[PDB]
Amino acid sequence: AVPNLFVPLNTNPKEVQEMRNKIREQNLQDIKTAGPQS
Amino acid sequence: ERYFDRVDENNPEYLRERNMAPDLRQDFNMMEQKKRVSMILQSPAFCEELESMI
């Protein structure tokens, strides 16, 4: 059994697309951000 | 712009339009063309017979 072992269940598919679109939008605005401060 | 005019996700009972089999598309139209349920109820002579028999 356990076909869904590697992934969690009952997750909204829209959120992944929204965050992918956000990463896409970062290129169009090409805002330059420094790395996180240690 | 038809595509701006209406949105598939705005109305679920318009969303039913997209996901229909063709023979299911005929069955609804033909069956509400016939109006059998209206015919049986509106016709009295069969109606009170069914009433009293039950």
Binding site: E15, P36, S38 | -
Partner: protein, 374 residues
């Protein structure tokens, strides 16, 4: 949690890429080579440098012998891999490995000891709080942005096809072919001999790779292009060596990548990449094939040859039934696509559940990686 971003490291056979989560492009991209000197050292007071790794190993390649730690997607030498990881973490990104989790990528069909040793190295030495291992071709679908499709990833070490339908991957239809740009570079170095040019050292292999990246393309029809090349000299191009000598590649330009479609030029018995993709499609069920026909995704640096998409579409259309519609999706950023997918996977709020904690590793040894991940 909010300001802390997990590091994303794409680790292929050819080049290593690294950056932060939530970024569109990787911060550090550099070749994965480790070079060592071979000649006499006579000037006293210049200092001692035992090993050269990364981009500045390429700059001084004249006096070095170059070794690749990863061969065919397998880490043959682990000490050099530790050198590459240390140079990535400290010199390239200037981040402490304790601060952030690490996301790694690998080939689909690999020996188990590779994954176990990756987990052991990233916990025992660099002391990371969490780590995850994923498949490159799965991350390519994240970068594409679609739920379903078949991914053909071709890098420097290995080529592989995986199909995914509705977020479900079929393990029995995953196909692996040991035919990448490494063997294409070797084939180009072999076929450049018949024009009088000889490259033998490991330093000249980088020159051959540069020649391949600058003056190669895929012909749409092989026999017609061969007849055209025999008839006229319009196909010839000139390249300049680092010492100022000029060579003329001529006929070889469309013959080096043609070994991807016909492996019999290399003596291999295996099928071409188009036949491999078609066979991976027909190994799936009947119903999903149409969708798998419509969302073929190209990835990896080997698929950057001009005209690869048209030839692939023509071959798949010839193999497939005529009533289906065949299109090949190749973004311009298909060299870095895997890394982008990793960032998209690393920044999800749900994926914070799926990290492998250090306590779980301490309980379960290096065998925890097979139970999680994929």
């Amino acid at each position: 949690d909010d300001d802390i971003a997990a590091l994303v490291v794409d680790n292929g056979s050819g080049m290593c890429k690294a950056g932060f989560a939530g970024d569109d492009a990787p911060r550090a991209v550099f070749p994965s080579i480790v070079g060592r000197p071979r000649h006499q050292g006579v000037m006293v007071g210049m200092g001692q440098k035992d090993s050269y790794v990364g981009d500045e190993a390429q700059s001084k390649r004249g006096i070095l012998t170059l070794k690749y730690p990863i061969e065919h997607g397998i880490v043959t030498n682990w000490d050099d891999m530790e050198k590459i990881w240390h140079h990535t973490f400290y010199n390239e990104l200037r981040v402490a490995p304790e601060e952030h989790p690490v996301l790694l990528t690998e080939a689909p069909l690999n020996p188990k000891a590779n994954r176990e040793k990756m987990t052991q190295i990233m916990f025992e030495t660099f002391n990371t709080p969490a780590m995850y291992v994923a498949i490159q071709a799965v991350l390519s679908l994240y970068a594409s942005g679609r739920t379903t499709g078949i991914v053909m990833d071709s890098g420097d070490g290995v080529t592989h096809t995986v199909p995914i339908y509705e977020g479900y991957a079929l393990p029995h239809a995953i196909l692996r072919l040991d035919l990448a740009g490494r063997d294409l570079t070797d084939y180009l170095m072999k076929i450049l001999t018949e024009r009088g040019y000889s490259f033998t050292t490991t330093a000249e292999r980088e020159i051959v790779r540069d020649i391949k990246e600058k003056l190669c393309y895929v012909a749409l029809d092989f026999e017609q292009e061969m007849a055209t090349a025999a008839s006229s000299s319009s196909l010839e191009k000139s390249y300049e060596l680092p010492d100022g000598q000029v060579i003329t590649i001529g006929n070889e330009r469309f013959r080096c990548p043609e070994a991807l479609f016909q492996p019999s030029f290399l003596g291999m018995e295996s099928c071409g990449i188009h036949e491999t993709t078609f066979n991976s499609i027909m190994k799936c069920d009947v119903d999903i094939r149409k969708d798998l026909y419509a969302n073929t995704v190209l990835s990896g640096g080997t698929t950057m040859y001009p005209g690869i998409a048209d030839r692939m579409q023509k071959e798949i259309t010839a193999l497939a039934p005529s009533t289906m519609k065949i299109k090949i999706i190749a973004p311009p950023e298909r060299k870095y696509s895997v890394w982008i997918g990793g960032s998209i996977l690393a920044s999800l709020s749900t994926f914070q559940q799926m990290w492998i904690s250090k306590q779980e590793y301490d309980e379960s040894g290096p065998s925890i990686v097979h139970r999680k991940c994929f």
